[PDB]
């Protein structure tokens, strides 16, 4: 029931993110936020596998990108993910 932009199936998310971080080099916050919404829904829907994958995929693609923009995008996305984890599971995602 958690969709990114309609994208529910995992890989539909994963492509859609790839295209997003790959085409765009100044992303609208509108979009950034929906990813944050997407991830907190994954926490609320009890899908930590998916979320741990999603976090990581876009950790790689986002910190790989030459745009510093994307690099701060990720930090924002994860911070909000973690205060919600910290209150739902009493834990913070381990990000090695």
């Amino acid at each position: 029931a958690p969709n990114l932009a309609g994208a529910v199936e995992f890989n539909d998310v994963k492509t859609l993110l790839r295209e997003w971080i790959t085409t765009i080099s100044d992303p609208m916050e509108e979009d950034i936020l929906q990813v944050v919404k997407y991830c907190t829904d994954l926490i609320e829907e009890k899908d930590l596998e998916k979320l741990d994958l999603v976090i990581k995929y876009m950790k790689r693609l986002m910190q790989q990108s030459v745009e510093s923009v994307w690099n701060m995008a990720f930090d924002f996305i994860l911070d909000n993910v973690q205060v919600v984890l910290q209150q739902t599971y009493g834990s913070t995602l381990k990000v090695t």
Binding site: A5, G6, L16, W20, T23, E30, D31
Partner: peptide, 8 residues
């Protein structure tokens, strides 16, 4: 913006 105009 991106995700809105993404419904394909």
């Amino acid at each position: 913006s991106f995700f809105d105009k993404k419904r394909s």
